[PDB]
Amino acid sequence: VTGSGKKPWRQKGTGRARSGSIKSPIWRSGGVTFAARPQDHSQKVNKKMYRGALKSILSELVRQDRLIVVEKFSVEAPKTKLLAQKLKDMALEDVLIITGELDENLFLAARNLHKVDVRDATGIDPVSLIAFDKVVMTADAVKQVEEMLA
Amino acid sequence: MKRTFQPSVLKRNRSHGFRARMATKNGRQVLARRRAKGRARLTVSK
Amino acid sequence: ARVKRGVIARARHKKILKQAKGYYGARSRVYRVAFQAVIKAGQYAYRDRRQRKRQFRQLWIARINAAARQNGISYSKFINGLKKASVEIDRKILADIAVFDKVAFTALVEKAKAALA
Amino acid sequence: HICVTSKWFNIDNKIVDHRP
RNA sequence: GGUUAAGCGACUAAGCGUACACGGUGGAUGCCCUGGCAGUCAGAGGCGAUGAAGGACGUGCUAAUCUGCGAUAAGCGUCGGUAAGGUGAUAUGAACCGUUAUAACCGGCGAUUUCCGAAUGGGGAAACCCAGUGUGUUUCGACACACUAUCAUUAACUGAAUCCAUAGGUUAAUGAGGCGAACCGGGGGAACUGAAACAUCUAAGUACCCCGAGGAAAAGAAAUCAACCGAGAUUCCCCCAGUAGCGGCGAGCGAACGGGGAGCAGCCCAGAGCCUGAAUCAGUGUGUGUGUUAGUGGAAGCGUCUGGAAAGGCGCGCGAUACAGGGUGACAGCCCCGUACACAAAAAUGCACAUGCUGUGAGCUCGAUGAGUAGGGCGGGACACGUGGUAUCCUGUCUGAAUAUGGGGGGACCAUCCUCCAAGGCUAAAUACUCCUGACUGACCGAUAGUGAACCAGUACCGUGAGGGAAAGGCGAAAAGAACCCCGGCGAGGGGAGUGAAAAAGAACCUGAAACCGUGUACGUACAAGCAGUGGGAGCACGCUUAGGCGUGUGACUGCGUACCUUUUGUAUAAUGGGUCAGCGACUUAUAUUCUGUAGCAAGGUUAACCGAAUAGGGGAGCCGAAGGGAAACCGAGUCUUAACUGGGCGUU
RNA sequence: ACCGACUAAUGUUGAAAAAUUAGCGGAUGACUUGUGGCUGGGGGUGAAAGGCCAAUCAAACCGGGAGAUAGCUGGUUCUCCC
RNA sequence: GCACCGAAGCUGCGGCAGCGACGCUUAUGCGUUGUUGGGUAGGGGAGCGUUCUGUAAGCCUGCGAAGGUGUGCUGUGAGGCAUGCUGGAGGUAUCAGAAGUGCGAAUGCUGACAUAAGUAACGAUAAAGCGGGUGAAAAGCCCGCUCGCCGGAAGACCAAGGGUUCCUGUCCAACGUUAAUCGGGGCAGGGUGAGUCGACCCCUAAGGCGAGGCCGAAAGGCGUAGUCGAUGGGAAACAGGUUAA
RNA sequence: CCUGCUUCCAGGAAAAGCCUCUAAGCAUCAGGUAACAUCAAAUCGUACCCCAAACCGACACAGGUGGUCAGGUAGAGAAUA
RNA sequence: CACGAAUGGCGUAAUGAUGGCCAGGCUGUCUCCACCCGAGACUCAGUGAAAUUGAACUCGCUGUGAAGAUGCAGUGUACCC
Numbered sequence A: 001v002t003g004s005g006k007k008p009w010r011q012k013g014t015g016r017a018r019s020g021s022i023k024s025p026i027w028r029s030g031g032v033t034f035a036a037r038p039q040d041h042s043q044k045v046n047k048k049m050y051r052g053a054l055k056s057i058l059s060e061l062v063r064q065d066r067l068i069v070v071e072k073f074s075v076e077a078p079k080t081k082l083l084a085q086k087l088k089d090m091a092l093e094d095v096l097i098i099t100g101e102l103d104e105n106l107f108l109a110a111r112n113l114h115k116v117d118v119r120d121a122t123g124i125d126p127v128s129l130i131a132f133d134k135v136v137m138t139a140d141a142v143k144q145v146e147e148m149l150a
Numbered sequence B: 001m002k003r004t005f006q007p008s009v010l011k012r013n014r015s016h017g018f019r020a021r022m023a024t025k026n027g028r029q030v031l032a033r034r035r036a037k038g039r040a041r042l043t044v045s046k
Numbered sequence C: 001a002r003v004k005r006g007v008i009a010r011a012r013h014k015k016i017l018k019q020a021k022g023y024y025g026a027r028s029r030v031y032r033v034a035f036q037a038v039i040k041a042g043q044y045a046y047r048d049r050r051q052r053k054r055q056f057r058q059l060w061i062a063r064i065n066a067a068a069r070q071n072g073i074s075y076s077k078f079i080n081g082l083k084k085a086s087v088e089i090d091r092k093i094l095a096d097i098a099v100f101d102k103v104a105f106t107a108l109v110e111k112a113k114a115a116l117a
Numbered sequence D: 001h002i003c004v005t006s007k008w009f010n011i012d013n014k015i016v017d018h019r020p
Numbered sequence E: 001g002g003u004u005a006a007g008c009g010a011c012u013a014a015g016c017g018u019a020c021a022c023g024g025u026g027g028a029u030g031c032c033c034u035g036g037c038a039g040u041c042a043g044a045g046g047c048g049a050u051g052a053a054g055g056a057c058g059u060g061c062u063a064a065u066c067u068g069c070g071a072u073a074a075g076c077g078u079c080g081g082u083a084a085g086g087u088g089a090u091a092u093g094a095a096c097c098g099u100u101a102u103a104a105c106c107g108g109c110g111a112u113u114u115c116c117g118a119a120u121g122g123g124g125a126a127a128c129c130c131a132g133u134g135u136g137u138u139u140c141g142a143c144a145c146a147c148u149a150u151c152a153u154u155a156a157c158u159g160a161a162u163c164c165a166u167a168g169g170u171u172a173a174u175g176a177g178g179c180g181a182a183c184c185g186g187g188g189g190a191a192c193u194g195a196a197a198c199a200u201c202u203a204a205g206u207a208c209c210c211c212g213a214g215g216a217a218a219a220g221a222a223a224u225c226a227a228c229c230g231a232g233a234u235u236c237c238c239c240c241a242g243u244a245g246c247g248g249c250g251a252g253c254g255a256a257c258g259g260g261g262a263g264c265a266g267c268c269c270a271g272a273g274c275c276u277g278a279a280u281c282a283g284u285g286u287g288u289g290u291g292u293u294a295g296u297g298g299a300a301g302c303g304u305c306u307g308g309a310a311a312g313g314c315g316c317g318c319g320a321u322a323c324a325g326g327g328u329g330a331c332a333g334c335c336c337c338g339u340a341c342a343c344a345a346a347a348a349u350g351c352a353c354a355u356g357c358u359g360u361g362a363g364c365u366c367g368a369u370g371a372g373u374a375g376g377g378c379g380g381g382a383c384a385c386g387u388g389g390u391a392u393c394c395u396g397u398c399u400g401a402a403u404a405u406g407g408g409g410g411g412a413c414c415a416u417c418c419u420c421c422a423a424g425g426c427u428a429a430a431u432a433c434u435c436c437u438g439a440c441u442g443a444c445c446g447a448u449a450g451u452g453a454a455c456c457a458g459u460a461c462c463g464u465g466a467g468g469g470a471a472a473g474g475c476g477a478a479a480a481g482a483a484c485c486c487c488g489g490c491g492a493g494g495g496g497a498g499u500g501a502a503a504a505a506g507a508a509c510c511u512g513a514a515a516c517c518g519u520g521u522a523c524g525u526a527c528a529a530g531c532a533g534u535g536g537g538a539g540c541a542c543g544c545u546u547a548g549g550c551g552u553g554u555g556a557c558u559g560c561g562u563a564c565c566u567u568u569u570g571u572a573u574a575a576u577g578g579g580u581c582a583g584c585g586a587c588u589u590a591u592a593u594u595c596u597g598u599a600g601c602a603a604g605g606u607u608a609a610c611c612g613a614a615u616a617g618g619g620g621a622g623c624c625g626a627a628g629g630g631a632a633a634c635c636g637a638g639u640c641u642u643a644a645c646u647g648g649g650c651g652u653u
Numbered sequence F: 001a002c003c004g005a006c007u008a009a010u011g012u013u014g015a016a017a018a019a020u021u022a023g024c025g026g027a028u029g030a031c032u033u034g035u036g037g038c039u040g041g042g043g044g045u046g047a048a049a050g051g052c053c054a055a056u057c058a059a060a061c062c063g064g065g066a067g068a069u070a071g072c073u074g075g076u077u078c079u080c081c082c
Numbered sequence G: 001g002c003a004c005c006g007a008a009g010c011u012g013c014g015g016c017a018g019c020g021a022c023g024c025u026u027a028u029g030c031g032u033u034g035u036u037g038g039g040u041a042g043g044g045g046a047g048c049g050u051u052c053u054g055u056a057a058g059c060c061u062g063c064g065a066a067g068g069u070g071u072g073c074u075g076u077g078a079g080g081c082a083u084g085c086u087g088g089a090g091g092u093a094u095c096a097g098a099a100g101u102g103c104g105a106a107u108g109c110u111g112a113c114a115u116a117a118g119u120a121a122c123g124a125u126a127a128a129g130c131g132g133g134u135g136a137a138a139a140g141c142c143c144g145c146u147c148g149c150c151g152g153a154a155g156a157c158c159a160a161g162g163g164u165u166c167c168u169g170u171c172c173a174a175c176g177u178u179a180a181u182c183g184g185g186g187c188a189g190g191g192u193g194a195g196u197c198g199a200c201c202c203c204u205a206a207g208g209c210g211a212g213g214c215c216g217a218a219a220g221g222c223g224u225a226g227u228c229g230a231u232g233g234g235a236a237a238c239a240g241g242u243u244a245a
Numbered sequence H: 001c002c003u004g005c006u007u008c009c010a011g012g013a014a015a016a017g018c019c020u021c022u023a024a025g026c027a028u029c030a031g032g033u034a035a036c037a038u039c040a041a042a043u044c045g046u047a048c049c050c051c052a053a054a055c056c057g058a059c060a061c062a063g064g065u066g067g068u069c070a071g072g073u074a075g076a077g078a079a080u081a
Numbered sequence I: 001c002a003c004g005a006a007u008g009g010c011g012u013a014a015u016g017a018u019g020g021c022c023a024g025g026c027u028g029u030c031u032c033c034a035c036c037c038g039a040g041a042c043u044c045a046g047u048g049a050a051a052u053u054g055a056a057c058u059c060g061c062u063g064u065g066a067a068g069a070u071g072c073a074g075u076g077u078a079c080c081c
């Protein structure tokens, strides 16, 4: 805190409480006993535990058939409205859609649809699998994941 | 009774004025600190 | 995450002052003073829940006694009678009947006297 | 107000030695 | 019924208490955020005698202050960009200026740029006094302007004691000087403290003073490690390991070998001959490309309900490579500004290349190979290493080699072996930092918080001075900021009126708590003694209920009853602390280690840095465990002890 | 006059962080006074009291090391169960 | 010797919780039933609420969010839910997650407000009285007549220091220890005229600075030539008048 | 008048302006002296308080603040009334 | 107990807001206090502080008690301000 380190007033004599530094947490302006610092909240998560979780997650998405796997999935042009329709026809609003190799148009559509995202095979993270109401995934991606998790 | 401040500008300037301040490496550091502090009166002169 | 505090604080405080309603001067105005007043009131109560049962019993026993004497017999003898009056058990409060039904009482006195004969 | 200058002494001063 | 007598007896409230209602005071709470805080990614890393940082005084249609600016003074020119509105803010008004391109506004480059300040013509109490010399006047005096500091280098001219020659002196050309957040190298260098005292030791080469420099600094091309196998400059990261060691063997301090990663780069001088300006580097002009300093275009919403107001609800459409964000009378993809996306530079510039000009050397042959040095003596200092058996490095002091058949090192020291070439230099990257520019982010704060400063704050104020250093945010959607009338002193303040959704939002203005102070009503209170309540409890006022010893308020009378904290063997204590309220105010964070829980896997478990398609995947360098015993060599389900165990110690489940 | 400060009372939340009133000492001297100068912190100055060095002195003040250290005193905030 | 009073002990009725067992019945909970439940330092267990992230482009909310103030209900408690009034724009279940997470004390910090109390006091015991003006109001201002006080000052001119306090109009909220028509207070306007007074200037004392120079780890120290520095030296105007100043 | 005069020891600034002297230097010149005439003298300060209500004392504070002037009656008097 | 000769011995005129003792004068210093004149204190009007303060419905006595009680026991006394 900004101030000098001068003792505010005599130890003894004034009828006053002891007082030592004008920056004392007990005093008003200036203090904070245990001021925080920038800090790192990154946890570890074992390799085998991460994989262990994805499996428990997939193997639950089927069990609620929230995972619908498809041979090929792609939109014909970089236009959101197209994708909006595909989903409409497929009976879907909230979707993860993990594509095999990922293409330009499928990504630019959905960039603006809020409840729908599209990831490549490597981009699969745990919260998302649970996040969306339905995970799509091309049968091509399935084989990728099949191995990634061993 | 006669108290401690007996004003006199000649002495004031000679002892605390700009030029006096300027005449010593530390006197200059005096200004430097006051400038960095952004003080409106570097040294109370005419 | 800095915590405002102080909305919950006056909640705690008013929670106490409300309990102090009625008390004299600072005891009902000034928290620091009220929180004490509120506690000790509690302390007496907890005590005086037990006292209540004492105070009334001796209230009852006091008036049981005059009525007994009124029918010419001390409380001592009179409870001993009813005790000995072929077992038989009956509250000292319920001797309420001493105030509201004096024949019933005298009637109880006789029954007691008989056992003592 | 302007109203803000307190140079409270030292105790005040006179007397006391209170038998030793 | 009268008279008398005895007995018992309400209504009183000067004031006080409790309760409730309505206020005052006061500014908490919540909501708010052009202010802060921490970072990421990029840019920029300097300014300055061409006069800086920072100021003084000026400057307007202008009295003050702020910003801008400098006697060309909120400005001038020019090149672009943009344009229907403009003449900075408090801040109206006046007088103006402009609308299809010389209004304003934005950017590039110019111009002007008083005085003080390194201040540099001399002086000086900063913003002032005074000069020498040059210039300057159809009114050629005195004033105005320019130049004149010092040091360094170079040249020229001059030139003593002293003749030569030097020193000295004048002029001239260049450069320096001062300021500035950190990072960096260097010269100096504390004590508190820790050791439960204190000298050695620690704190610590820290804080601080000083000098210097760069965009980074430093370091760097083995007289290095290794261990007979090999590696191959420096720097940074993870290991090795809190190990080996150091140590009043206290407190503490603490490597290296080797391994995994980031980035990788190597060259000159110690020189002459020939050939000669041939590589290259910097300074510079041009060109080009690419970033920068203004800009351009940029999709799609309506109906109705509530309301002061729609962006809200409900209905039905539409855009989306645009649902980042802000604003608008409440919450807006489609009202506005943007956003995605696609574009743009007249000029000036950062960065790359390409060349021109200057300066510079390339190349081949044959040579050369860093002495007051290495080492030693004395004294200190550095190496994790405190003199220790102490290698190694530095040097204040005195000394002092060999020179390739030579010399350094391999931790006393010697041999052998191995390995390197000191006593000259340069060198990019991985590394550090953020005064400042741009953009973006937050399980960061929200006015006692957050910067000291959300506000004209380093201000007001305090101090001779260094220096210290505050308080203080919110009317409303919009000022529509209350015309007019009345009391009053052509007052203060108030009541009407009017504006508004609201005036109880009226400027002492959102919310408006608490201490604290009043007015009103109910009940109690003037024969009564104490932590002031609690158990009982009539009466009164009020509601009830249909009564029904019921709710609320008060509380005669009455049983019991000495606050809280702390500290103590023990406190009503006449022992501490608190006048009261409100807000704030004290077991945290990081890294190690061990235990419990829990999860994964299991005789295995797990990766660190780093790579990265960046929470994935890669990376097993490494750490823990599966074997113990012994100081150790070593042995091994055993081992140590001893000549040896009937044994014994530690281990084998 | 000017320079001093021996006694007393008053004053002691003063009129005054050191004075008022009545008396008192020196008053051509080691006198007294205006202006300006020099001496700096383990240092100054001192007809010497540890006096004075800006109402501060057995080591001035301001900033820093700095959150010195405190085996001492104080305080340590919501609830329930064993 | 027999009564009886008497405790939070014993018993009775209802209730909670831990540990037991036995029976109903076991991702247990019932019903019994025996038993245990004072407590400082302190150990263990389980929880409330606050701020913030997700869940959440969800949900609540101008038909009224947060906050404030009442009221009812509810839980063992920290609390919760509902709602009237106020308020006028935000709030967030649930399950997870993270802490500036809870105040009565520290002669704690900041602000606000009490108390003593309408008490002390209103700053020299030189002293006032009356008449008349002005004014909303006159003990205090203006004018007048008395009275009293200083007169080596309590008169007059400056330096130092201040820095518009000067003069004139105007106002009385705040400042004035009361009132205030008055002021050294607010606002506005005015006012400082020099060859001769003074500064600048020439001259130097103390002392300061100091090209070169001597000295010093750096910073710097001392000092020559000089150059600065008045408290001293250096040319010259007097009597009178006039301005509200 | 008097920076005099007398006397004493503790022995009482400096420099310039002013006067005079010449050196280098100029010698008809320039300069120097006088009379009269004329021209120049800038700039900055100048209000007010100043033993105090305007300065140092936090105050309209019984304190502190250097220089200058000094009438009548009594009196030695700047005492005192 | 326990001076002593330059951390000087013994004397000493004069000087001293120096210490001790005595006397004349003098008196309100005292016996022993009375009266008076002025400034406060008191009343009215105006302005308007302070320290302290856990909370107060804040009596006496004898006793108890962390051992010296307005607050505990007992008791006496007491209309409110």
Ligand SMILES: N[C@@H](Cc1c[nH]c2ccccc12)C(=O)O
Residues within 6 Å of the ligand: D010, D011, D012, D013, D014, D015, D016
């Ligand atoms: N009376 C003083 C005590 C004291 C005696 N001498 C002093 C000197 C200075 C200050 C105070 C004192 C007080 O109240 O505490």
Ligand SMILES: N[C@@H](Cc1c[nH]c2ccccc12)C(=O)O
Residues within 6 Å of the ligand: D014, D015, D016, D017, D018
């Ligand atoms: N102690 C003595 C004298 C005294 C008064 N004040 C003092 C301050 C410090 C020392 C002593 C004193 C007394 O009180 O009567």
Ligand SMILES: [Mg+2]
Residues within 6 Å of the ligand: A004, A005, A006, F066
């Ligand atoms: Mg300090």
Ligand SMILES: [Mg+2]
Residues within 6 Å of the ligand: A029, A030, A031
């Ligand atoms: Mg802070």
Ligand SMILES: [Mg+2]
Residues within 6 Å of the ligand: none
């Ligand atoms: Mg990983």
Ligand SMILES: [Mg+2]
Residues within 6 Å of the ligand: C053, C054
């Ligand atoms: Mg009982």
Ligand SMILES: [Mg+2]
Residues within 6 Å of the ligand: none
């Ligand atoms: Mg009355």
Ligand SMILES: [Mg+2]
Residues within 6 Å of the ligand: none
């Ligand atoms: Mg009342």
Ligand SMILES: [Mg+2]
Residues within 6 Å of the ligand: none
């Ligand atoms: Mg100059």
Ligand SMILES: [Mg+2]
Residues within 6 Å of the ligand: none
């Ligand atoms: Mg100069």
Ligand SMILES: [Mg+2]
Residues within 6 Å of the ligand: E195
């Ligand atoms: Mg120690």
Ligand SMILES: [Mg+2]
Residues within 6 Å of the ligand: none
């Ligand atoms: Mg080899």
Ligand SMILES: [Mg+2]
Residues within 6 Å of the ligand: none
């Ligand atoms: Mg545009």
Ligand SMILES: [Mg+2]
Residues within 6 Å of the ligand: none
């Ligand atoms: Mg658009």
Ligand SMILES: [Mg+2]
Residues within 6 Å of the ligand: E369
């Ligand atoms: Mg060599």
Ligand SMILES: [Mg+2]
Residues within 6 Å of the ligand: none
């Ligand atoms: Mg180098």
